Design a protein around this ligand. Structure first.
Ligand SMILES: Nc1ccc2oc(=O)ccc2c1
Ligand SMILES: Nc1ccc2oc(=O)ccc2c1
Ligand SMILES: N[C@@H](Cc1c[nH]c[nH+]1)C(=O)O
Ligand SMILES: N[C@@H](Cc1c[nH]c[nH+]1)C(=O)O
Lengths: 412, 412
């Protein structure tokens, strides 16, 4: 017997599970359309070189990579943002800006689940915090569309520029900044000792300064540290003013501990969370204004975006009882009275489908009662019995499942 | 500079290309719903063991396989049917039958394009030709939905049982039958000499018999060879009677040369083709009643299905001028008169999206004329200018792009 289980860390989606996944994806697609984003895609297989960032990132450390027969170093993508930038870099000046692009790629890791789907939303060519505002609103909109409220979830927001100043002023060379963010991202996960030790290895005074600024609880307190008109203060203020104007003020808040784990974030960063403190981050993103420059863009291209995985959100929705099983449905099941009626039933099936209805025909030889049972099992709205006596009169028998003779023309 | 091109043999789908792909997939999804099929999915990564059929198949020969870090032999799936059977075998008696399942997996090869998407449609648990009838009608329906007619395309249909008889009667051991089909499938591609030589290696008289039955041009001629009531003759006759009753008689025909290249087909086989003779097969499928038994099913499970790739169909549609560029559209573009109006414009943006409309807001600081230009470029139906004078009156200016003051409430 063949192995029935899927490959290690990978999920099967039989129809029941697929309906749940489709319920989620339908929201991702619907939200992107509502917000005027355009779909794109790229190959799950990318060059390994695309992800070599040398910053100690979990995402690049846990890369599902291999070598081809032809000796090329490839990887099943651990994230989408590098593929997006590749695409953008390829287009150059032909790309009209601003651009708002989205996708729902399967992304991979190797270390535990080894694959997940991740809704990606990115705004390209927008310098101002208006981009981050729209992105955060889009994530909130998706969560609201799924049945959650601002009592269930929120989005924590910060700017890496605050920390950038502290690292720069303390005297640390800026090439260590991305490594620092990556390490400080571990704070909530591991003891402050371990995190303190990691920064020591990187290269005590400056470490204290980092720690203090992470734990500042309000924006006023940040403004006391760096000034009321520091770059980050005005941007965060504008960000909250705009989100409030859109009507999502209750969904967002400031949190100085939020840095995210990716090397490339330069500005505002954010992450979604459940207000019971039970789950990992629901989504995460930020501004990354230098990535395209590091890829070789002759001109700086401002960018911002987020990823929103398919797994944590599902656990939250299940906890909140927002993912009831939604059984399969079909409009019509056409039932031949017997096999002599099959040709006529097929003509009827054609008509129903011609009208835009979803319809089955009983394919096996079976008794009328069992055909009605099958009709119930598949969630048919209507059973259409095609029998000789009614057929003679230009009719079929129609029975609403949630048996009257009806002229063919009146079926639809 | 990073490599902008995708990995060898793999496609990027920036928004323009993605719209075309989505036009196709929308038809695949819509046809499956019309026909009452249920979506499923499984991992692109499967165990290599799943595909080791030892029959000289092109599909298993050109397998994109590799070994994991942990030494497990895996493959990016070359086709979906084995994953489907794995899923079915896993469910056992819990699976209610008949079942009609579909998916649109990316499938992979290594040798030239190395990936394609392939719409898969399969009916499980149906013994009679009614399954093949529905499947062939579904493929025709998809092609019609894309703008093609029976003048553009058709589906050629045959049964492997005819050949099975000839191979069995000639005295050849039945374990060579699948290898024979695989070889005879090459007939149209390579010279009859090469094909004749391949069968010789497998193990002259029986070879002639095979050749003769492949070139019989009608079903009556098959009935002369094997009898009017041979198993295959009654099934083919019933198949054409049913397709004709559904109203697709003009789309289908008999062709004794059609065997397909897969080892597992046992009965009716079929393939779509363009009637100008310019392209490779548009789709292909058949009945495979023994596969689940070879996977270890305690009870035989009848199955039939097809695959329908995303590449050949697109070339055909382009030749027929049925894939015009469909530019991006959005309902509204909201334009702040200036930055002082941004908060109010955001409130307006919220209202529009609340009503189910697709809407952008101008994110950058820009002049009203350039904002109107951007609105045209993104294919906006309407520009909503949010200006101080109108705002004072509880109004905005609305301009149909394919400028009158309008009360907020009347926008939607
Ligand atoms: N890169 C990345 C990150 C997180 C992930 O979480 C999963 O559960 C499966 C895959 C995955 C891939
Ligand atoms: N197994 C399989 C068969 C045919 C294919 O044709 C392509 O163009 C790309 C991938 C592919 C994979
Ligand atoms: N690639 C990021 C999310 C993201 C998209 N755009 C910007 N950031 C992640 O995987 O967490
Ligand atoms: N797996 C087959 C198509 C198919 C689906 N179901 C049965 N046959 C192919 O790739 O050609």
């Amino acid at each position: 017997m063949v192995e029935t289980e899927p490959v290690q860390g990978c999920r099967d989606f039989p129809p029941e599970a697929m309906r749940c996944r489709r319920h989620l994806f339908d929201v991702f697609h619907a939200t992107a359309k509502t917000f005027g984003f355009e779909e794109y895609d790229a190959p799950v297989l990318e060059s390994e070189e695309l992800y070599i960032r040398k910053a100690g990132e979990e995402i690049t450390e846990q890369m599902f990579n291999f070598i081809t027969k032809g000796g090329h170093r490839v990887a099943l993508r651990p994230e989408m943002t590098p593929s997006l930038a590749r695409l953008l870099l390829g287009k150059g000046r032909s790309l009209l800006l601003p651009a708002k692009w989205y996708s729902i790629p399967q992304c991979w890791r190797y270390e535990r689940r080894r694959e997940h789907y991740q809704w990606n939303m990115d705004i390209v060519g927008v310098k101002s915090v208006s981009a981050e505002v729209e992105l955060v609103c889009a994530a909130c909109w998706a969560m609201r569309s799924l049945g959650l409220s601002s009592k269930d979830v929120g989005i924590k927001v910060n700017s890496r520029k605050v920390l950038q100043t502290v690292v720069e002023q303390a005297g640390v060379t800026s090439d260590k900044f991305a490594p620092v963010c990556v390490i400080v991202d571990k704070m909530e996960k591991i003891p402050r000792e371990e995190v303190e030790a990691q920064l020591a290895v990187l290269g005590p005074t400056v470490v204290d300064a980092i720690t203090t600024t992470l734990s500042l609880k309000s924006i006023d307190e940040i403004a006391q540290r760096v000034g009321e008109e520091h770059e980050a203060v005005k941007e965060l203020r504008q960000f909250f003013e705009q989100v409030e104007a859109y009507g999502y003020g209750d969904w967002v808040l400031f949190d100085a501990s939020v840095v995210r784990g990716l090397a490339y974030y330069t500005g505002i960063v954010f992450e979604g969370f459940d207000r019971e403190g039970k789950f990992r981050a629901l989504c995460g993103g930020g501004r990354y204004d230098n990535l395209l420059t590091t890829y070789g863009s002759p001109t700086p291209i401002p960018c911002a975006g987020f990823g929103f995985g398919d797994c944590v959100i599902v656990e939250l929705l299940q906890e909140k009882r927002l993912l009831p099983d939604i059984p399969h449905v079909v409009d019509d099941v056409v039932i031949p009275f017997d096999e002599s009626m099959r040709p006529h039933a097929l003509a009827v099936l054609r008509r129903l489908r011609d009208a835009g209805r979803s319809a089955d025909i009983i394919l096996d030889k079976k008794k009328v009662v069992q055909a009605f049972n099958y009709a119930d099992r598949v969630g048919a709205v209507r059973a259409v019995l095609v029998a000789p006596e009614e057929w003679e009169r230009g009719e079929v028998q129609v029975k609403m499942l949630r048996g009257f003779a009806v002229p063919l023309d009146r079926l639809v």
